[PDB]
Design an enzyme around this catalytic site. Structure first.
Site, PDB file in Angstrom:
ATOM      1  N   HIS A   1       0.790  -1.222   0.000  1.00  0.00           N
ATOM      2  CA  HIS A   1       0.000   0.000   0.000  1.00  0.00           C
ATOM      3  C   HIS A   1       0.822   1.271   0.000  1.00  0.00           C
ATOM      4  O   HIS A   1       0.270   2.332  -0.300  1.00  0.00           O
ATOM      5  CB  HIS A   1      -0.924  -0.013   1.201  1.00  0.00           C
ATOM      6  CG  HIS A   1      -2.088  -0.916   1.018  1.00  0.00           C
ATOM      7  ND1 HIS A   1      -2.900  -1.316   2.054  1.00  0.00           N
ATOM      8  CD2 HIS A   1      -2.599  -1.469  -0.105  1.00  0.00           C
ATOM      9  CE1 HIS A   1      -3.858  -2.088   1.576  1.00  0.00           C
ATOM     10  NE2 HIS A   1      -3.694  -2.199   0.272  1.00  0.00           N
TER      11      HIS A   1
ATOM     12  N   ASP B   1     -10.083  -2.763   1.124  1.00  0.00           N
ATOM     13  CA  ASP B   1      -9.040  -3.229   2.020  1.00  0.00           C
ATOM     14  C   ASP B   1      -9.724  -3.748   3.269  1.00  0.00           C
ATOM     15  O   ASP B   1     -10.818  -3.308   3.625  1.00  0.00           O
ATOM     16  CB  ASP B   1      -8.069  -2.092   2.351  1.00  0.00           C
ATOM     17  CG  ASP B   1      -6.885  -2.513   3.212  1.00  0.00           C
ATOM     18  OD1 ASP B   1      -6.714  -3.690   3.560  1.00  0.00           O
ATOM     19  OD2 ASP B   1      -6.129  -1.614   3.601  1.00  0.00           O
TER      20      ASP B   1
ATOM     21  N   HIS C   1      -8.324  -3.068   5.971  1.00  0.00           N
ATOM     22  CA  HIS C   1      -7.856  -2.052   6.888  1.00  0.00           C
ATOM     23  C   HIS C   1      -8.184  -0.677   6.343  1.00  0.00           C
ATOM     24  O   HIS C   1      -8.412  -0.497   5.147  1.00  0.00           O
ATOM     25  CB  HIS C   1      -6.354  -2.173   7.071  1.00  0.00           C
ATOM     26  CG  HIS C   1      -5.923  -3.560   7.394  1.00  0.00           C
ATOM     27  ND1 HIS C   1      -5.590  -4.475   6.418  1.00  0.00           N
ATOM     28  CD2 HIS C   1      -5.834  -4.212   8.574  1.00  0.00           C
ATOM     29  CE1 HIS C   1      -5.277  -5.621   6.991  1.00  0.00           C
ATOM     30  NE2 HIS C   1      -5.413  -5.489   8.297  1.00  0.00           N
TER      31      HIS C   1
ATOM     32  N   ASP D   1      -5.858   1.663   6.889  1.00  0.00           N
ATOM     33  CA  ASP D   1      -4.476   2.075   6.631  1.00  0.00           C
ATOM     34  C   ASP D   1      -4.300   3.584   6.756  1.00  0.00           C
ATOM     35  O   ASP D   1      -3.562   4.214   5.998  1.00  0.00           O
ATOM     36  CB  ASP D   1      -3.991   1.578   5.276  1.00  0.00           C
ATOM     37  CG  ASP D   1      -3.751   0.105   5.262  1.00  0.00           C
ATOM     38  OD1 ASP D   1      -3.612  -0.476   6.350  1.00  0.00           O
ATOM     39  OD2 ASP D   1      -3.628  -0.460   4.165  1.00  0.00           O
TER      40      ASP D   1
ATOM     41  N   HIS E   1       2.872   0.564   4.836  1.00  0.00           N
ATOM     42  CA  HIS E   1       1.695   0.027   4.172  1.00  0.00           C
ATOM     43  C   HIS E   1       0.474   0.128   5.072  1.00  0.00           C
ATOM     44  O   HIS E   1      -0.655   0.059   4.581  1.00  0.00           O
ATOM     45  CB  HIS E   1       1.918  -1.425   3.763  1.00  0.00           C
ATOM     46  CG  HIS E   1       1.794  -2.395   4.894  1.00  0.00           C
ATOM     47  ND1 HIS E   1       0.616  -3.054   5.178  1.00  0.00           N
ATOM     48  CD2 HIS E   1       2.677  -2.775   5.843  1.00  0.00           C
ATOM     49  CE1 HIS E   1       0.794  -3.831   6.230  1.00  0.00           C
ATOM     50  NE2 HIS E   1       2.036  -3.680   6.652  1.00  0.00           N
TER      51      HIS E   1
ATOM     52  N   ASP F   1      -7.035  -3.739  -2.132  1.00  0.00           N
ATOM     53  CA  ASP F   1      -6.266  -4.743  -1.422  1.00  0.00           C
ATOM     54  C   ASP F   1      -6.954  -6.089  -1.564  1.00  0.00           C
ATOM     55  O   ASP F   1      -8.180  -6.196  -1.519  1.00  0.00           O
ATOM     56  CB  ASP F   1      -6.105  -4.397   0.056  1.00  0.00           C
ATOM     57  CG  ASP F   1      -5.018  -5.220   0.733  1.00  0.00           C
ATOM     58  OD1 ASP F   1      -4.480  -6.148   0.103  1.00  0.00           O
ATOM     59  OD2 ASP F   1      -4.680  -4.935   1.900  1.00  0.00           O
TER      60      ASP F   1
ATOM     61  N   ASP G   1      -6.741  -8.484   0.597  1.00  0.00           N
ATOM     62  CA  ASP G   1      -7.175  -9.063   1.857  1.00  0.00           C
ATOM     63  C   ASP G   1      -8.613  -8.704   2.201  1.00  0.00           C
ATOM     64  O   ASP G   1      -9.182  -9.310   3.109  1.00  0.00           O
ATOM     65  CB  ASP G   1      -6.216  -8.661   2.991  1.00  0.00           C
ATOM     66  CG  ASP G   1      -6.207  -7.155   3.304  1.00  0.00           C
ATOM     67  OD1 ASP G   1      -6.978  -6.354   2.740  1.00  0.00           O
ATOM     68  OD2 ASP G   1      -5.362  -6.749   4.126  1.00  0.00           O
TER      69      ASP G   1
ATOM     70  N   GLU H   1      -0.377  -6.099  -2.014  1.00  0.00           N
ATOM     71  CA  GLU H   1      -0.317  -7.173  -1.014  1.00  0.00           C
ATOM     72  C   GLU H   1      -0.394  -8.559  -1.643  1.00  0.00           C
ATOM     73  O   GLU H   1      -1.021  -9.468  -1.096  1.00  0.00           O
ATOM     74  CB  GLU H   1      -1.403  -7.011   0.049  1.00  0.00           C
ATOM     75  CG  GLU H   1      -1.318  -5.727   0.862  1.00  0.00           C
ATOM     76  CD  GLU H   1      -0.140  -5.698   1.808  1.00  0.00           C
ATOM     77  OE1 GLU H   1       0.261  -6.774   2.300  1.00  0.00           O
ATOM     78  OE2 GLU H   1       0.379  -4.593   2.072  1.00  0.00           O
TER      79      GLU H   1
HETATM   80 MN    MN Z   1      -4.860  -3.166   3.059  1.00  0.00          MN
END
Ligand code: MN
Ligand code: MN
Ligand code: MN
Lengths: 317, 214, 317, 317, 214, 214
Positions: free
Chosen positions: C99, C122, C124, C126, C139, C230, C232, C275
């Site tokens: 990221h 994502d 997250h 972030d 990231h 992302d 994830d 990622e």
């Molecule tokens: Mn992320």
């Protein structure tokens, strides 16, 4: 706070189900460290240890119902302990173990809060009588002892004389039904109990189902809510190490949304986590996923939102 | 993998009173195991299904207790048809361990083996091999020895033994160590003695011959 | 066409995250052959190679923030390259990597389109600062450099002096939040940033969430949209070989529906795929599923509808 | 009853697809014991055995279409058998095998019920012509023989002279499309066939999609419904042992909801279960899950609700 | 599985100036590995955590460089307490390969082993075995040989050697090949010579006895 | 794992008429297998792709039938360039079993091997070894024997044989058993005879020498 004030009750109990190994339910969950995972956020964690459950060797069965007396002694001990910890104003976290423990859990909770409601999340209704059973296993028969409408329909089971039926047919909502007996479905249609099988969840979505659930239980009157949970209602992709694995269960995201909405009510008053069997894990990875699933369900019951949670102070300092 | 240890390894009892048996678990099974009747050369048969309660046509005398580590199996009224290898076996834990084996013998008295060594045939000398067979016969118990002597040389490894079952009639046993040799090693020696040491024997009985005698 | 006119930027970069191996992100995706999988449909594929990222050995850390200068040099090189390829009128496909690359990606995109918007998909947010971090990994800190509202709240990090905060708190929508720090959730509630955690997606459904997302970003003004993604945020059943595996992510079907709705806007102007770690695959099968997942996300970004796609001529000839 | 009155037709057939092994489709499903799993509830189970399919060695191909004549003989034999068992007033349960069998299935069903409709649940449209194919495999070309709108567009394939196009473009609904050819998508947009790809299911939810499906087919006129099903439309997490594994399929819960709504119509008149390949199972566990998935789909077609089912008598006796 | 090759296999340095060490990677780790201090018989201890930056109480002299294939470890100010087996170890790639081992010795001078063969005891002849023990003692370095001679027969395989650690006091070594024989093969011969070849020795020193001499 | 059994193991045919070959399946493949042309030292080449239909440049004569257990491969118009190991191989079942091997030879007549034993060199005696090489040469078919005789002692195991391919020119063969011995066992004997038994030979031909003769 008033919410996330926890009394922890571990019950290393298995005698209401055949497959021994759910005795290491509280053992694994405590060595999974649910306490420390509560202690970040504002949780009044207080364990009360495990209960010493006596081993009656002469636990003579009923016709089909097997081990009545040690299970009844277990739930009576647990009813005393649940009523004890709900005298403390805490939220009765009880975890085992199997559904036979939920009898004494709801019993001791109704000793303090007779106006409660039950969200029985499970693959099964577990509403079987001693007459309408096929196995006789009392984890398939917890609910029938607790229903006022089955009074007289319940035979005099040895060890359950203390049991008082405490809730009505309108007082309970099933969510997650996908393994229902013909006797169970007949009783469910007989009493007109509000429920939510997997059909209606796939129809409405988990948000609409939780909306209608809280509208049915708390739309009339704000009352203490006793979520009693089975891990098999979630899909065995997430929880394969359960006692009764039935495919097509709820998703992990759905169960987290359920528990988050329950926390956002704030009227959660007692939690029951049963059917945790590490011995049914084919890999330890299965055990790991199932235990982490149950822990994350409990944390989202006690405030761990997926959107994030913070102490109400400034962090830009 | 809960280890099931049966506390009587074997048992011998001339038919009579309580012949209670025992099995211990490595953990707490808590009345969730069963008792079995593997007869010799037969399929096993269920005796007790959950630590008691006398499964489905068991006659009158086969109670047991436990709950929940060390379990019992009461053979109270012996009934000598019941001489069979018995088994505790846990069930409510995976994988499902069995017991060790509970060969129930008969305890007549300690008798002496009638020891009979046998030369290999000349037909075996036509085969290019040689197997010397030393009997033991009509004795009690199985606790015996065979020490082969090849011009009085204590040998083993060339010898396979063979244990009869305990007879229904006279409760005896019969052994035969089979000193299987080459024909070449056979021709090297004559004095083929078989030192048999048994409890019914007062001495280590050495039954012998010479190559070409009988 | 105007859409699916692609500049491909590979960034074999790892220095903003601990676990080395996302350097083989563009390596595996190009040897997965995303180019040829674009070349069936009308894609103006033009790679621009990988960027040569210098290895500064004296990358002296901050207090908690580690490797500031090589990461800042990487994102500055990438900001130049993204601004270069968006001078070409193409759609800036950038893929790494982690990221920290999205800083320079959004930077060079804002050099061309200062009116952009960011869909940050994502697990997250972030959104961490150098102050409010727990790891210091950049990231976990890309977004805070790019927000105008955190001006002054951002310390003078060595290597990020060129960084201009380019978007506002209203300019960005989070989708997929299930691992949010208390600092992150505090900042999220502070700035009032529109977001969509897993709770609201489980409530509304992915169609209603995408509807509200495009209503929030493009219902006011049609503007270039920079989807920064992302892997994830999708569930690790589909993407286990990601740097930050968090269970309970979005489904593969949901992410495909997101990217299909983004293509049906046609205002997609820049894509970031980060990622991607093949070294975190426990099996090569894990790597295979994760890479195919990311490729299919990119193809559905560039027109590959699940309902089917055809060249607009007769085929019954 | 009128519903769940079953004629069982097994077709150990593979010659319309390349990968041999779907001949052991009815073999495994019958040794999975679908019959006994029907015999609890009120099912008039009557098998009619397997069909003896002749092996024509001189099955000379078309240009791209390979094995036309043995497949045509197979579907003609099957059309006779399906028309035979629908003269019995039963519900034609046919299972193989591959999609080439569905030609004769819909043919013999239309011999009895010319007013039928088809719910073609599949990852694919399978609407390919002999001209617009890429493989020539007739399991990719069943639907084109059965459409009245492709009359003249169908070449004179050897072995399919008996085939009468029986349904219209409005008579069929696709559900589960995620692998569609450009020729297939062009024909789909050409005839204006009502369909439901994975995009619209992710948008509307499976309940709204099934609602619109039954509104489209039975909202006009109550007519016999011939559900022809592919197992690859469900996600290969549940069905990996299918002939054409395409990721991102429907969930097991969604397919069960589909079949439960079909049973609650009661106008189900013929079921086709194809692409069952135990030889494509990497583990026997894969085979086990896939077979149990198909069986549970069939049981929910014939009344097995997830909410529970009972004989309409008292059980509290 | 990035192979970590440490370019000094071992090292010997009488305590002094820069004793810089080296480790190479099979790929580009890019400053993501660590340095370790496995002392003899001890748990390892972290020296450098990420290619530099002198982890958490390391005294004054243990810098290193790298970034990103061949890494260095500078032992600049030797401090002879630091004689330990050192380790590079990659981390940011799985699985996490260690280095080879960097035994740091002391370089006093090359000395000669005081060689002492020892007969087996008669108590060992009471045990039915025989182990002939040939010393090496107080020498440098470990680069030695033992050639057993059994009535002058060059034998091995019946002989296990034994390497002392380098002493803190005199930096020496001590060896003992242990010619473990049967008693029967012992009784076959007398002249039990031990040809020891070491650098401090000018000659291959053959230390001998006779069976029954001492 | 459907076993593919090729009914001709090998074949020999002086070039001529139909040389049809056969392969059987353990199940019903139903025209879903292929035919192959593994030439010696070469990559295999596809002959028939699905039980017939003469794949992509196959000349004029390579039809086959089957459908669906026992399949045929017709070599109708032999064309002696086609002497290669042939293969049925199922495909539409996993895993994808091959056939056995269909080495097509030439059937000239049965000829006698010109047998030539060869002493080891003295250069091999300088190496401390000895390998006695007994030729067979220019014969048909491969069905031969070698019985080594070491002062007329029937030995084997010390002997590795070596089979030439069938020649394009004269369709012959050549063998060489290589009686590799130690130099010590070589020095123990002189009469090194090589009893060669072949069909073209009327007798078991024993080609001999003496150690030090040639
Ligand atoms: Mn992320
Ligand atoms: Mn349950
Ligand atoms: Mn299909």
């Amino acid at each position: 706070a008033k919410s996330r004030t926890i009394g922890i009750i571990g019950a290393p109990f298995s005698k209401g189900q055949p497959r021994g190994g759910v005795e290491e339910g509280p053992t694994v969950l405590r060595k999974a460290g649910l306490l420390e995972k509560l202690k970040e956020q504002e949780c009044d964690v207080k364990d009360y240890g495990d209960l010493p459950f006596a081993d009656i060797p002469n636990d003579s069965p009923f016709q089909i119902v097997k081990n009545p007396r040690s299970v009844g002694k277990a739930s009576e001990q647990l009813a005393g302990k649940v009523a004890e910890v709900k005298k403390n104003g805490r939220i009765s976290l009880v975890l085992g173990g199997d559904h036979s423990l939920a009898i004494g859990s709801i019993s001791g909770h109704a000793r303090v809060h007779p106006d409660l409601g039950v969200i029985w999340v499970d693959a099964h209704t577990d509403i079987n009588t001693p007459l309408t059973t096929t196995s006789g296993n009392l984890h398939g028969q917890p609910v029938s002892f607790l229903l006022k409408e089955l009074k007289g329909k319940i035979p005099d089971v040895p060890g359950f004389s203390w049991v008082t039926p405490c809730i009505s047919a309108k007082d309970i909502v099933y969510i997650g039904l996908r393994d229902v007996d013909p006797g169970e479905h007949y009783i469910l249609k007989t009493l007109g109990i509000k429920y939510f099988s997997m059909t209606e969840v796939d129809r409405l979505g988990i948000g609409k189902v939780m909306e209608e659930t809280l509208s049915y239980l708390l739309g009339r009157k704000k009352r203490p809510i006793h979520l009693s949970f089975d891990v098999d209602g979630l899909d065995p992709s997430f929880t394969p190490a359960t006692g009764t694995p039935v495919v097509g269960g709820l998703t992990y995201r759905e169960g987290l949304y359920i528990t988050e909405e329950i926390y956002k009510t704030g009227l959660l008053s007692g939690l029951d986590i049963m059917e945790v069997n590490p011995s049914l894990g084919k890999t330890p990875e299965e055990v790991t996923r199932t235990v982490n699933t149950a822990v994350a369900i409990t944390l989202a019951c006690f405030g761990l939102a997926r959107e994030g949670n913070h102490k109400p102070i400034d962090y830009l300092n | 993998e809960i280890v099931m240890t049966q506390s009587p390894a074997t048992l011998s009892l001339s038919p009579g009173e309580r012949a209670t048996l025992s099995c211990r678990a490595s953990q707490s099974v808590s009345s969730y195991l069963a008792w079995y009747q593997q007869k010799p050369g037969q399929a096993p048969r269920l005796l007790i299904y959950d630590a008691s309660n006398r499964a489905t046509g068991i006659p009158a005398r086969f109670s047991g207790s436990g709950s929940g580590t060390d379990f019992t199996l009461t053979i109270s009224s012996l009934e000598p048809e019941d001489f069979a290898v018995y088994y505790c076996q846990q069930h409510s834990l995976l994988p499902r361990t069995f017991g060790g084996g509970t060969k129930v013998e008969i305890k007549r008295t300690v008798a002496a083996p009638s020891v009979f060594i046998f030369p290999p045939s000349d037909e075996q000398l036509k085969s290019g091999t040689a197997s010397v067979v030393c009997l033991l016969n009509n004795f009690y118990p199985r606790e015996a020895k065979v020490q082969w002597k090849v011009d009085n040389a204590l040998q083993s490894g060339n010898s396979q033994e063979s244990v009869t079952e305990q007879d229904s009639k006279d409760s005896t046993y019969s052994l035969s160590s089979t000193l299987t040799l080459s024909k070449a090693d056979y021709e090297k020696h004559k004095v083929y003695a078989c030192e048999v040491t048994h409890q019914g024997l007062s001495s280590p009985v050495t039954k012998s011959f010479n190559r070409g005698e009988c």
